[PDB]
């Protein structure tokens, strides 16, 4: 049998890729972004369906021989009620009809868009959730405030801003005392533009006689109050107790501006 020149190959030395186990990489795969390959090591053929069900947002790619595979994110399936009412959760796990922040074997990953709070993807959900008993002061104030500085800066994120402002203008004209509307009026003031000031006066002038009699007596003084204020050189807002006791969010723009014209002596001026 012409005794062949046999020789065995050198003993194998596995790399880090070859020692990867996908069942330990839930915290590595979840933060992965689009167009990024996350190598998971050699994957047996019978475990492919187990991996593809755990990560439906990802595409399983056979990258090399011996079953070497990687995961490539294709989409974000995060729903509005699970991604929009928080700013710290980037993903969650679904198992047996329940939603959890912690991974568990047999659960399905679902991830939120990184720009979900930089665009307008949450405006519809939070417009209803920030009304009534579901109002969360922290989340809802941060949502309204973050709109005025919409990080998208895209011609679409800028238009979703105008759509939201028209909705809040219609809602808050019916009643400006609800907490989400008082927050909207406050953030319009802080924006300090000609459009935001114009929208403030529009909303406050649309209010009922009940609202104006309750919150806007600094803007609508009585006959005797207005007549007596003509006897002083300073603006009425600088001494009127109705203006010193007023909610600044319900002041007309003129009254708000006049409040800062009161010639404060060095120290405390009143």
């Amino acid at each position, epitope marked *: 049998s012409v005794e062949l020149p046999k020789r065995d190959p050198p003993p194998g030395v596995p790399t880090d890729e070859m020692l990867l186990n996908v069942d330990k990489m839930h915290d590595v795969i979840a933060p992965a972004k689009l167009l990024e390959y996350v190598h998971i090591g050699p994957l047996a053929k019978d475990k492919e369906d187990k991996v593809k069900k755990r990560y439906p947002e990802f595409r399983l790619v056979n990258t090399g021989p011996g079953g070497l595979s990687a995961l490539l994110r294709q989409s974000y399936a995060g729903t509005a009620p699970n991604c929009c009412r928080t700013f710290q959760r980037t993903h969650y796990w679904k198992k047996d009809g329940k939603i959890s922040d912690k991974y568990e074997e047999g659960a399905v990953l679902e991830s939120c868009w990184p720009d979900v709070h930089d665009t307008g993807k949450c405006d519809v959900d939070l417009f209803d959730w920030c009304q009534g008993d579901t109002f969360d002061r922290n989340i809802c104030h941060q949502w309204i405030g973050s709109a005025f500085n919409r990080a998208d800066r895209t011609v679409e994120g800028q238009q979703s801003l105008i759509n939201l402002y028209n909705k809040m203008q219609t809602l808050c004209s019916k009643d400006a005392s609800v907490p989400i509307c008082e927050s909207f009026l406050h953030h319009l003031r802080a924006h300090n533009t000609e459009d935001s000031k114009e929208m403030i*006066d529009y909303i406050l*002038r649309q209010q009922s006689a009940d609202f*104006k009699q309750k919150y806007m007596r600094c*803007s*609508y*003084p009585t*006959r005797d109050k*207005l*007549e007596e*204020s*003509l*006897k002083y*050189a*300073e*603006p*009425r*807002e600088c001494w009127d107790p109705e203006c010193s006791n007023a909610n600044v969010n319900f002041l*007309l723009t*003129r009254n708000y*501006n*006049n409040l800062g*014209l009161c010639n404060i002596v060095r120290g405390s001026g009143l």
Partner: nanobody, 119 residues
Framework: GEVQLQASGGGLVQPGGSLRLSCAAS????????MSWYRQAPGKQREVVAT???????DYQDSVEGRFTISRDMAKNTVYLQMNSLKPEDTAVYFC????????????WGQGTQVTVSS
């Protein structure tokens, strides 16, 4: 004498129209006085409609807020009153009023101009 607060610009216009009243002051400097537009309905007491301080801060009567606007021209020493969306209850004689900053005795009232809106 010779403190002159003559009001003009009135007239007749259908409800919803607009008027612009004028009051070219003489003998009075605006940087010293508070200028206030009054009005007096037939058979009723006079009431202040708008006002502007010597610094330029304005204030209005509630039933005219948003519709009327009082402004100043320091060079021309003339105060103005833009009237928009005139309602039938705005029919009155509108006249000027100058009040000194810290001299209560130096108050002067001017001759009015007729404002009438109807159909």
């Amino acid at each position: 004498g010779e403190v002159q607060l003559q009001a003009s610009g009135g007239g007749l216009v259908q409800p919803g129209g607009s008027l612009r009243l004028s009051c070219a002051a003489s003998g009075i400097v605006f940087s010293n006085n508070r200028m206030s537009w009054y009005r007096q309905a037939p058979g009723k007491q006079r009431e202040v409609v708008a006002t502007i301080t010597s610094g330029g801060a304005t204030d209005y009567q509630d039933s005219v807020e948003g519709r009327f606007t009082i402004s100043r021209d320091m060079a021309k020493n003339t105060v103005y009153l833009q009237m928009n969306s005139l309602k039938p209850e705005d029919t009155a004689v509108y006249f000027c009023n100058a009040r000194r900053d810290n001299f209560a005795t130096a108050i002067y009232w001017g001759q009015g101009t007729q404002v009438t809106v109807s159909s």
